[PDB]
């Protein structure tokens, strides 16, 4: 069946700048009635997929002026003038001119901003989880920009990898910055062997890590 | 308003029939369009996989062999997708969507429901306070969470407060570990309020109807 593949953007773009988002075809999709069946939709972040443009350039009902379709029958443009934080998400290519009306692979759109240091917190064990037998230490770096971002564990001083998991937020459509999540999980044996637990946080925006810490 | 929306069981077993339904609000399934359902696996790909139209004439995805079946009940304004002899390979989010004869969908696509394909266990989360260590900087902001530790299937809905606390929050996506689930979610509020003003978070596993409310308490 048709192939549809869409570039990736190599860049963030900034509040304000404009920005084209491309799909190819391996078939035409230009049919007999001289359309061109071809839709555009974005995907925002947590949210179902959003149709911007059906029939290769009209826009659906609702949908800022904004977002505009254009192209031939086996190349398409979405060019997304004046882009806003909101904007921030997935934008998918659909062709719709024979089945099994295949979609493209997505192209994330990334919303430049201001670099923003993390809000770093720890948090010990609950003692409920630790009368289970369980003893899990939380830290979050909250509203960061970019995204790029180390974590770091000790447990007395010493760095430790095992038993921890981490979790990052998609671009947030009103800040444009990024958060992540830290678990280190334990017995609460071998919680209870240690007293200082650490997380650190290395991020462009400083040269020396961002350290938060406390004593069981 | 034309609206759409799925539901069904949020865990499945391997080897038997997903069953989802759709319920059309705002416009009868006997007006004109390909009444139709999507997936959306892990790591986001899209998968058309049909349409009924008409009431009674079908068209699939070649990807889904004999497996599918697409039906409706005009009477309930419900159309319905039937997959047999799942396996894990068919846990994603399932929509339904209005397509019209050039490709429009309107806003007429689903909230989605996710559907998990596996053998394990339902399994109710633990909710766990957190609380911070000590004391810190004030008359500024304060940052608490929640530890959901330990259920299955996907999905959990977290709240602040009700829903009253909607600014300031992150919930996080969850991390899958030995068949169970973990995320947390953190909530900031201006240092006045707490612990002054409770703080609790709300924690809903409709796959298990388990709801937890937890009050975060200082140390």
């Known amino acids: 069946d048709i192939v549809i593949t869409q570039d990736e953007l190599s860049n963030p773009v900034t509040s304000g700048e404009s920005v084209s988002i491309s799909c190819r075809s391996s078939?035409?999709?230009?049919?007999?009635?001289?359309?061109?069946?071809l839709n555009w939709f974005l995907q925002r972040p947590g949210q179902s997929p959003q149709l911007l443009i059906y029939?290769?350039?009209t826009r659906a009902s609702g949908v800022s002026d904004r977002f505009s379709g254009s192209g031939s029958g086996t190349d398409f443009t979405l060019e997304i003038s004046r882009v806003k934080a909101e904007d921030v998400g997935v934008y998918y290519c659909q062709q719709f001119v024979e089945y099994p009306f295949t979609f493209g692979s997505g192209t994330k759109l990334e919303i430049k901003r201001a670099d923003a240091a993390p809000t770093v917190s720890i948090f010990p064990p609950s003692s409920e989880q630790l009368t289970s037998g369980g003893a899990s230490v939380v830290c979050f770096l909250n509203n960061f920009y970019p995204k790029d971002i180390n974590v770091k564990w000790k447990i007395d001083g010493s760095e430790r990898q095992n038993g921890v998991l981490n979790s990052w937020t998609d671009q947030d459509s009103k800040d444009s910055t990024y958060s992540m999540s830290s678990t280190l999980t334990l017995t609460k044996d071998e919680y209870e062997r240690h007293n200082s637990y650490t997380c650190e946080a290395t991020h462009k925006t400083s040269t020396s890590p961002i350290v938060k810490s406390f004593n069981r | 308003e034309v609206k759409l929306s799925e539901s069904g069981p949020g865990l499945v077993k391997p080897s038997q029939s997903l069953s989802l339904t759709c319920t059309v609000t705002?416009?009868?399934?006997?007006?004109?369009?390909?009444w139709t359902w999507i997936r959306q696996f892990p790591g986001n790909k899209l998968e058309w996989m049909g349409y009924?139209?008409?009431?009674?004439?079908?068209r699939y995805n070649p990807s889904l062999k004999s497996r599918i079946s697409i039906t409706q009940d005009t009477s309930k304004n419900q159309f319905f997708l039937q997959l047999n002899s799942v396996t894990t390979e068919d846990t994603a989010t399932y929509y339904c969507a209005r397509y019209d004869y050039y490709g429009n969908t309107g806003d007429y696509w689903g909230q989605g429901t996710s559907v998990t394909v596996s053998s394990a266990k339902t399994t109710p989360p633990s909710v766990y306070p957190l609380a911070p260590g000590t004391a810190a900087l004030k008359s500024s902001m304060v940052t608490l969470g929640c530890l959901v530790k330990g259920y299955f299937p996907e999905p959990v809905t977290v709240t602040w407060n009700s829903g009253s606390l909607s600014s300031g929050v992150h919930t996080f996506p969850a991390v899958l570990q030995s068949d169970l689930y973990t995320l947390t979610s953190s909530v900031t509020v201006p240092s006045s309020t707490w612990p002054s003003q409770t703080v609790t978070c709300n924690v809903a596993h409709p796959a298990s109807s388990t709801k937890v409310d937890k009050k975060i308490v200082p140390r």
């Open positions: 078939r035409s999709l230009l049919y007999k009635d001289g359309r061109t069946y």
């Open positions: 029939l290769m350039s």
């Open positions: 705002g416009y009868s399934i006997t007006t004109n369009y390909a």
């Open positions: 009924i139209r008409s009431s009674v004439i079908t």
